[PDB]
Amino acid sequence: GRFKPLAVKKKYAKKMNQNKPVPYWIRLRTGNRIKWNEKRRHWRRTKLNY
Amino acid sequence: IKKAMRKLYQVKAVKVNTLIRPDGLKKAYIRLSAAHDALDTANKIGL
Amino acid sequence: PREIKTLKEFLAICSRKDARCVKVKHNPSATKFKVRCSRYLYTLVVNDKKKADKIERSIHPSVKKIAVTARS
Amino acid sequence: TKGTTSMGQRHGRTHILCRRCGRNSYHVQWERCAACAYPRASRRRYNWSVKAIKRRRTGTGRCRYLKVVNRRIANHFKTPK
Amino acid sequence: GKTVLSCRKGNGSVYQVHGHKRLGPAKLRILDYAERHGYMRGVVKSIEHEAGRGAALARVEFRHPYKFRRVKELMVAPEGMFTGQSVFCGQKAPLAIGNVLPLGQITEGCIVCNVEAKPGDRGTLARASGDYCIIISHNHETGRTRLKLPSGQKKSVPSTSRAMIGIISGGGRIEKPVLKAGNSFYRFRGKRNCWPKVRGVARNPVEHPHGGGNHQHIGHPSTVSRHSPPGQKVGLIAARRTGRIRGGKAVKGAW
Amino acid sequence: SCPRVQYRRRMHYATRGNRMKMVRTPGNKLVMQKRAKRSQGIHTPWVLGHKRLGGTKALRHIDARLASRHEKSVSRAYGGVLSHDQVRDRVVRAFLVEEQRIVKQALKEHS
RNA sequence: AACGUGUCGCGAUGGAUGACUUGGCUUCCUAUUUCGUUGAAGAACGCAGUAAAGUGCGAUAAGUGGUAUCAAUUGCAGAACAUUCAAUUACCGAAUCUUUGAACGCAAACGGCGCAUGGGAGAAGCUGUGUCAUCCCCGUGCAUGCCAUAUUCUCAGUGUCGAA
RNA sequence: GUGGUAAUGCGGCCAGGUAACAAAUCAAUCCUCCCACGGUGAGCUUUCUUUUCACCAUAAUCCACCUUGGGCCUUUUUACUCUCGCGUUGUUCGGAGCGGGGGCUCAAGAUUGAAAAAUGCAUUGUGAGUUCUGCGUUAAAGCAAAAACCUGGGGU
RNA sequence: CCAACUGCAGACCGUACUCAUCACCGCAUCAGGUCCCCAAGCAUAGAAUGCUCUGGUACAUAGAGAAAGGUACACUCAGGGAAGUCGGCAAAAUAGAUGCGUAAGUUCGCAAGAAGCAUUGGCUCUGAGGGCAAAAAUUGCCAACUCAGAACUGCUUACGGCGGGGAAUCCAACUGUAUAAUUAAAACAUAGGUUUGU
RNA sequence: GCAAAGAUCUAACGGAGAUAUACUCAACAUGCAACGUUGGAUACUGGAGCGGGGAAGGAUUUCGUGCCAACGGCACUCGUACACGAGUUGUUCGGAAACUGAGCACAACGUUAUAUCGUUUUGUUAGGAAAGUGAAGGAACUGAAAAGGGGCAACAGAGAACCUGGGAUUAUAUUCCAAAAAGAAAUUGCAUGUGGG
RNA sequence: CGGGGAAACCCAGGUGGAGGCCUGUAGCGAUGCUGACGUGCAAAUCGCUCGUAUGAUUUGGGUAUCGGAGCGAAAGACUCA
Ligand SMILES: [K+]
Ligand SMILES: [K+]
Ligand SMILES: [K+]
Ligand SMILES: [Mg+2]
Ligand SMILES: [Mg+2]
Ligand SMILES: [Mg+2]
Ligand SMILES: [Mg+2]
Ligand SMILES: [Mg+2]
Ligand SMILES: [Mg+2]
Ligand SMILES: [Mg+2]
Ligand SMILES: [Mg+2]
Ligand SMILES: [Mg+2]
Ligand SMILES: [Mg+2]
Ligand SMILES: [Mg+2]
Ligand SMILES: [Mg+2]
Ligand SMILES: [Mg+2]
Ligand SMILES: [Mg+2]
Ligand SMILES: [Mg+2]
Ligand SMILES: [Mg+2]
Ligand SMILES: [Mg+2]
Ligand SMILES: [Mg+2]
Ligand SMILES: [Mg+2]
Ligand SMILES: [Mg+2]
Ligand SMILES: [Mg+2]
Ligand SMILES: [Mg+2]
Ligand SMILES: [Mg+2]
Ligand SMILES: [Mg+2]
Ligand SMILES: [Mg+2]
Ligand SMILES: [Mg+2]
Ligand SMILES: [Mg+2]
Ligand SMILES: [Mg+2]
Ligand SMILES: [Mg+2]
Ligand SMILES: [Mg+2]
Ligand SMILES: [Mg+2]
Ligand SMILES: [Mg+2]
Ligand SMILES: [Mg+2]
Ligand SMILES: [Mg+2]
Ligand SMILES: [Mg+2]
Ligand SMILES: [Mg+2]
Ligand SMILES: [Mg+2]
Ligand SMILES: [Mg+2]
Ligand SMILES: [Mg+2]
Ligand SMILES: [Mg+2]
Ligand SMILES: [Mg+2]
Ligand SMILES: [Mg+2]
Ligand code: NA
Ligand code: NA
Ligand code: NA
Ligand code: NA
Ligand code: NA
Ligand code: NA
Ligand code: NA
Numbered sequence A: 001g002r003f004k005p006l007a008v009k010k011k012y013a014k015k016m017n018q019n020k021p022v023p024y025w026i027r028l029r030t031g032n033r034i035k036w037n038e039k040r041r042h043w044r045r046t047k048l049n050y
Numbered sequence B: 001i002k003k004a005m006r007k008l009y010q011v012k013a014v015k016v017n018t019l020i021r022p023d024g025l026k027k028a029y030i031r032l033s034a035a036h037d038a039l040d041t042a043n044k045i046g047l
Numbered sequence C: 001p002r003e004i005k006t007l008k009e010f011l012a013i014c015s016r017k018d019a020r021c022v023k024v025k026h027n028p029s030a031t032k033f034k035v036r037c038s039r040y041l042y043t044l045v046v047n048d049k050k051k052a053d054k055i056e057r058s059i060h061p062s063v064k065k066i067a068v069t070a071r072s
Numbered sequence D: 001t002k003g004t005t006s007m008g009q010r011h012g013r014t015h016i017l018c019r020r021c022g023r024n025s026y027h028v029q030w031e032r033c034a035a036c037a038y039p040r041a042s043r044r045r046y047n048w049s050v051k052a053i054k055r056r057r058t059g060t061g062r063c064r065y066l067k068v069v070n071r072r073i074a075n076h077f078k079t080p081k
Numbered sequence E: 001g002k003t004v005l006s007c008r009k010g011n012g013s014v015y016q017v018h019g020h021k022r023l024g025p026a027k028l029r030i031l032d033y034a035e036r037h038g039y040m041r042g043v044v045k046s047i048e049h050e051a052g053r054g055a056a057l058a059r060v061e062f063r064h065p066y067k068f069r070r071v072k073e074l075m076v077a078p079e080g081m082f083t084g085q086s087v088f089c090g091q092k093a094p095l096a097i098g099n100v101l102p103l104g105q106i107t108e109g110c111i112v113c114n115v116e117a118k119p120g121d122r123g124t125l126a127r128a129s130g131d132y133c134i135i136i137s138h139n140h141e142t143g144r145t146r147l148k149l150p151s152g153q154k155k156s157v158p159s160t161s162r163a164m165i166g167i168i169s170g171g172g173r174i175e176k177p178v179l180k181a182g183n184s185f186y187r188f189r190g191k192r193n194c195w196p197k198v199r200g201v202a203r204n205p206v207e208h209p210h211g212g213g214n215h216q217h218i219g220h221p222s223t224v225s226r227h228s229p230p231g232q233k234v235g236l237i238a239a240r241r242t243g244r245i246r247g248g249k250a251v252k253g254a255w
Numbered sequence F: 001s002c003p004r005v006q007y008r009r010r011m012h013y014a015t016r017g018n019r020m021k022m023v024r025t026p027g028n029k030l031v032m033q034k035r036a037k038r039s040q041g042i043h044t045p046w047v048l049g050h051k052r053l054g055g056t057k058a059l060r061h062i063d064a065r066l067a068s069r070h071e072k073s074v075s076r077a078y079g080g081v082l083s084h085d086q087v088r089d090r091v092v093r094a095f096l097v098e099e100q101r102i103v104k105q106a107l108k109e110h111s
Numbered sequence G: 001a002a003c004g005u006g007u008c009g010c011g012a013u014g015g016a017u018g019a020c021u022u023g024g025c026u027u028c029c030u031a032u033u034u035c036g037u038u039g040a041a042g043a044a045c046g047c048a049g050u051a052a053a054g055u056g057c058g059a060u061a062a063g064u065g066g067u068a069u070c071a072a073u074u075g076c077a078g079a080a081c082a083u084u085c086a087a088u089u090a091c092c093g094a095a096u097c098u099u100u101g102a103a104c105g106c107a108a109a110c111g112g113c114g115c116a117u118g119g120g121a122g123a124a125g126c127u128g129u130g131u132c133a134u135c136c137c138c139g140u141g142c143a144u145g146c147c148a149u150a151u152u153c154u155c156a157g158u159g160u161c162g163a164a
Numbered sequence H: 001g002u003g004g005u006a007a008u009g010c011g012g013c014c015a016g017g018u019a020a021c022a023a024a025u026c027a028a029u030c031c032u033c034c035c036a037c038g039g040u041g042a043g044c045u046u047u048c049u050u051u052u053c054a055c056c057a058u059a060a061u062c063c064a065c066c067u068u069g070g071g072c073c074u075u076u077u078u079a080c081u082c083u084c085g086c087g088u089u090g091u092u093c094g095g096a097g098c099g100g101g102g103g104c105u106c107a108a109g110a111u112u113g114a115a116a117a118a119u120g121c122a123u124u125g126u127g128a129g130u131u132c133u134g135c136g137u138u139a140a141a142g143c144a145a146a147a148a149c150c151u152g153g154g155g156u
Numbered sequence I: 001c002c003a004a005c006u007g008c009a010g011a012c013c014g015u016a017c018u019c020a021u022c023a024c025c026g027c028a029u030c031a032g033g034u035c036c037c038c039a040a041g042c043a044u045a046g047a048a049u050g051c052u053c054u055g056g057u058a059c060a061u062a063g064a065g066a067a068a069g070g071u072a073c074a075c076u077c078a079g080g081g082a083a084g085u086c087g088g089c090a091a092a093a094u095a096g097a098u099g100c101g102u103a104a105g106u107u108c109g110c111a112a113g114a115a116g117c118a119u120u121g122g123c124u125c126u127g128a129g130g131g132c133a134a135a136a137a138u139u140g141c142c143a144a145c146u147c148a149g150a151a152c153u154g155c156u157u158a159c160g161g162c163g164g165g166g167a168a169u170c171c172a173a174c175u176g177u178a179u180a181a182u183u184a185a186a187a188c189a190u191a192g193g194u195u196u197g198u
Numbered sequence J: 001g002c003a004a005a006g007a008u009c010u011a012a013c014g015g016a017g018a019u020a021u022a023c024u025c026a027a028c029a030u031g032c033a034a035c036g037u038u039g040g041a042u043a044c045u046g047g048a049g050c051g052g053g054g055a056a057g058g059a060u061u062u063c064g065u066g067c068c069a070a071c072g073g074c075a076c077u078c079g080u081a082c083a084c085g086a087g088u089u090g091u092u093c094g095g096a097a098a099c100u101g102a103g104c105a106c107a108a109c110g111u112u113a114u115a116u117c118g119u120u121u122u123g124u125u126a127g128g129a130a131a132g133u134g135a136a137g138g139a140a141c142u143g144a145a146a147a148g149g150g151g152c153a154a155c156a157g158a159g160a161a162c163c164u165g166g167g168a169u170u171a172u173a174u175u176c177c178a179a180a181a182a183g184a185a186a187u188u189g190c191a192u193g194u195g196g197g
Numbered sequence K: 001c002g003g004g005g006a007a008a009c010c011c012a013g014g015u016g017g018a019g020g021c022c023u024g025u026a027g028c029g030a031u032g033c034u035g036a037c038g039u040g041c042a043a044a045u046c047g048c049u050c051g052u053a054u055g056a057u058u059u060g061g062g063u064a065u066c067g068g069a070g071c072g073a074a075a076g077a078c079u080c081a
Helices: A006-020 B004-010 B040-047 C007-014 C049-056 D004-008 D050-056 D063-075 E005-013 E033-037 E181-189 F062-064 F084-111
Strands: B012-019 B025-031 C019-027 C031-035 C043-044 C062-069 E041-048 E057-063 E070-076 E086-090 E101-102 E109-114 E133-138 E144-148 E154-158 E162-165 F020-024 F030-034
Touching: B004 B012, B004 B040, C007 C031, C007 C043, C019 C049, C031 C049, C043 C049, E033 E041, E033 E086
Parallel strands: C019 C062, E086 E101
Antiparallel strands: B012 B025, C019 C031, C031 C043, E041 E057, E041 E086, E057 E070, E101 E162, E109 E133, E109 E162, E133 E144, E144 E154, F020 F030
16 A cells, blocks of 8 residues: 555565666676575565564 | 755746656656747757 | 736835736737736736726836736 | 365464574564564573574574674784784 | 353353443542532533443543643533533532532431542442432441432441432433344443343253253242352242242342 | 546545535646535634524634634624624623622621 | 397496595693674675675775785786885784664664754855855764762742841 | 623633544535537538547635524513424424524635636536535443643732 | 744645456466445336446457257146145246235234235326415415326237245244254244342 | 457567478478567557556555576466566655544443443533642742543544755656755744844 | 413424334345256256345455464354365
8 A cells, every 4th residue: 555664665675676687797797606586575575574 | 856956057946846766766746937949948958 | 916906006006116027818809907916916907908008108118018918 | 064065264474584693483472482482582492492492502603793702702813013 | 960050150251341432430530638628619521421331421520730721521421411501510519409518417317429438439339320329317426428229228337428419310221121132232332241141941951950851841949049159040040039029029149 | 528537636535624625627637626624603602502504604723813803703792702692691691690799608607 | 020038248327436635523721812882793795807695804895004924816817016116925003994783863665854063065156266055965062770979050848947 | 901781893820722533314526427508620421410539627725795504782671372383304492591683703605806727628508426514312322642732810 | 922924935745547347365467355435327216127328348269050969047838636746846827006905923012015896008187285575365476296087099908027825734933043065953042031250 | 168348460679499301302291389679561459548647455566687497277488477686765745743533441430140241422420538740939949720530432524844856776756966955935942143223 | 383281291293204113126145846957058957936235234355363283153063165
């Protein structure tokens, strides 16, 4: 709904900002072990419940 | 924000509308007075 | 909005520094002189065409007359 | 009926986020945290759960001040001449 | 076993007074200097009902003795108290319905209510609707007045205790049959959570001494000792006698 | 094509403080507008009868504050608090009771 | 004959085994070795040219200063004092150190609201300049208790005295 | 400060009032629907159909001032003399002042105009719903409070 | 002095979208559950039920297609009519409105819609029931539907929706409550009565 | 087995998703089945709505473009999927500043080996000295009277100054619109003049 | 309000809308089919049927009382399957 405390809104904003895939140049690096973000979140799979 | 607009761009802000974006940043809609042109100020800003 | 019913009061209103502008409306029967002050829109309605004509002249130059019409 | 329908009956929330520990263990009505006992001055700590203690103890954060003062102790509070 | 219901009520919990719409405690005036040496004159401003109380209440307005201000008193109204009536309280007040006098200033045989058990009590005896005390006698040596309480017991109090002249209003209430469970529901709505009543033999033996059996029965005498611990003291508590009372009803209570 | 309306201010419950009126706009739209709460108006004391006072308006908060004073009283003594009849009663009572007191004091002095 | 059986060669599925181990576990030792109101531990939010996590850091934010070291970092980009001013590393004395939290001006599912005191900005009027009401921004102090203290602060008591 | 016989009109402290309150009935404001009439557009048109469908709108805020209902004033008050009168759909009311005449006041609406056509889309009458509002029975049930605000009583 | 202008200034946070036969809970886009507002036309007593303008939708794996045997918010059935069965379970049946009529018993309130009998379509008419104005018991204009009564003319008894009824026995007075997920009862409560303590 | 909630049909367009062929073979009998959009047809929801808005809960699912590996128990050219890029505008709307309620419990005090216990609105804390400033009077320094400390608890109670038009978005709007503010108001806080009796 | 009545009172017809009153929506429940389903749509649901539907009624939010315990119109019911 409309209401949320600004702090909850900021936590949700940070979670949105984190829900991004890995840049590919990260995969080109010398000792790289990461290929997928593995902490990706879909709003329908798992809840944050803020 | 009005005072900083005056100090940084030598322009008069007649109205500042603000919002906090869903990414967490605050965005400002700043209407200048009719004595100032937004396009000229944007050009000097480099916009 | 405020109505003014006497020409003398209309001229007192038009003499104010608050008078930003004068909008003039020609209705089929009457003519309306609307003065935009700081707080109120002041309207004098005149039923003579000649009286309205004499008013549309001789208004100060510092304030501006606006002939209101339909616009695009 | 208990079960699925009553799962549909569950509205609201007993707990929200705690300002102190951030665990979503703050009882809204009682206004106290189930995880860290906020606003009581001291935190919750029970020896029947050493695992929870090891989850929360010193060193599970960043120790931002502790590292600096530990270095200063190790260097005997050295100062310029 | 589990905690008996009668012991659960002592915790307070959901069994406390329903006082939200109550107007406040009904009291006589403070036994101040003006009431000890002269009298205070008051005006009945309103007669009001309060939830949970049969008797009517009176808002009586007095002047403050020491400040420029008005003092509003909330009293249990005697029968006949009307709005606009003057109420005299004090040592020198006349003998009339609604007036408040010390018991030593009240003639024997007079009917009184709102009676102070101790001087300055502001009224603790004969306050339920229809109730009153009867002044039996004075002892001018000991300074004590003997009176008959509504229960039928006779008690002596210091003659300095104040009483209101008359009987408490609202009398006759318990004469009308309630007729309906809903009427009992509304009656107890403004009092406390004590209704409906579940018989102990209808309970299970875990929560009541009377519980259980393949018939509903108390399997032991229901008269229990005065020394029974809580949880065991249910039934007829320290009964001197049981069964239908034949002939004179003995005055209840202690000796 | 008959219209149906929506709450336009953020409160969506039909309470006595959230009454709505249906309004047709010059744009030919049916919208909801909040109906102002009304005050019951200035009264005599409740213990005295609780009757509306002649010559006083029923003004609610802001309109009471910004209204002129004579909108809320009359020029008679106790105007705005007591009716004319209650004023007459108090005047006659003051006079008569003080007269009785002076008569009894004169009697005591003469004894 | 068709399903279906058997055996062998070759494939698939499936990830056992073996070699490999910047990890674990266990034992032993050395010390100017033991946090915090000078605000800790912990929570939270941010910070890179490109940057989700992690690491590191704090609006000086994948870092400032210093001493060594000497030619990189590196996925791309960008930069280009070398006798040491390096996005090198190592170490450490100088600095920085957002919102909190014992959290302590009052509150709090509120990035909320004060008192005192220093500042800043400041429209319209005034001679572009200064000045500036309301409004706004920043610093500092302000919890409770206890100890000490007052170049000897201000008081209270039908406590005990006592003036001249 | 001031006018009216009056109802009432106009330019520290104390005590009241608003906020502030369950139900039904009967009238109802906007608004919704319908009907009548009249415009504008569209549809059907083998044959009928003066037809069928759509639309015809006016926000807040102000000025002036033609009904309904409540309270009240003044005046007539042999008003109720032996069938008193007034009034509700309804349970009433009156010398503690009914009814009539003339006024004062409050609450709902009207009407006039400013806003406002400069906007909007491609019109001015009735009947049914509708609780804003007006009209200030169950109860051994009698149906919150405070801030804030208002007015007076005293005093400057 | 301060009551109408006028001048400047009006800070903070929320605001997308959803609120569900896909956005919440039920491991899931689950026939379950989840508070509030606005709510049209005709039939009709109507927020019953059926159909419809505005808005919305054609999303739920589909195609072909009379095996047996199923499930159904699907029917029918000669003659008999409970003989079936533990038991009329299931199904059938009754039905709206209007007039007439209605027993035992009874706490006098009821029982009662007791039981029963009859009538209702369509057309064309007649009567009654009003408001406004200028023996006014009259003169004009006008609106909203109802109820009654005739003549004529039909029925294949024909949408939806909508009680079966009676005579007795046991129990509990009654309305309520109650074993979420096998028990709704005669159990609990209840008013009423009695006792106890104070 | 993917059967409750009745249902789709037709043409054109788009699309790799076709009218897809060894010989013979005119086309049938050798490329089937399925898509999204627009138009038309047919039907359903039937205002207690697969309508239009809110709370709780969710938190980007919203919007545009693109793309169909996995997911949408069939399918997809489509998507609440995935990728990229955007989007939420307030003196007056809701909250808070700033009310009280059922209640809560900091202080105070008491208790407890232990405060992480109890009391704390029946006008009201605490053996309890809890008020810090209207005035004056010669610019901020001094001080009367006033009994019962400080908070919190309602996004449906109390309270609260704005509302229409827009050719104004891809997505927000009583929030945006620019001197003819489309415009019309109301209301705070300070200041400036005119005038007063 | 009409009729009787010496009186007390009686017999009518209207008005009015009472009730833990009845039929019946929504709502709140859950009697029967011992129907469906019973590796379900569902770890209790579906259909028809049925109880009640102005009250001891239903419901949102807030608030109070719990594990040797709470709460209970009492079923050892319920206290996050
Ligand atoms: K979950
Ligand atoms: K067939
Ligand atoms: K058939
Ligand atoms: Mg949330
Ligand atoms: Mg905003
Ligand atoms: Mg209590
Ligand atoms: Mg039992
Ligand atoms: Mg036992
Ligand atoms: Mg037993
Ligand atoms: Mg028995
Ligand atoms: Mg027995
Ligand atoms: Mg990162
Ligand atoms: Mg604290
Ligand atoms: Mg929105
Ligand atoms: Mg909804
Ligand atoms: Mg219907
Ligand atoms: Mg229906
Ligand atoms: Mg579907
Ligand atoms: Mg399916
Ligand atoms: Mg047959
Ligand atoms: Mg037959
Ligand atoms: Mg047989
Ligand atoms: Mg047989
Ligand atoms: Mg049957
Ligand atoms: Mg009989
Ligand atoms: Mg019978
Ligand atoms: Mg019949
Ligand atoms: Mg029974
Ligand atoms: Mg029973
Ligand atoms: Mg019986
Ligand atoms: Mg019932
Ligand atoms: Mg029953
Ligand atoms: Mg069961
Ligand atoms: Mg029983
Ligand atoms: Mg199969
Ligand atoms: Mg349909
Ligand atoms: Mg709907
Ligand atoms: Mg699939
Ligand atoms: Mg996505
Ligand atoms: Mg309280
Ligand atoms: Mg509060
Ligand atoms: Mg607001
Ligand atoms: Mg009933
Ligand atoms: Mg079955
Ligand atoms: Mg048992
Ligand atoms: Na919501
Ligand atoms: Na500890
Ligand atoms: Na026992
Ligand atoms: Na569902
Ligand atoms: Na199938
Ligand atoms: Na994005
Ligand atoms: Na019927």
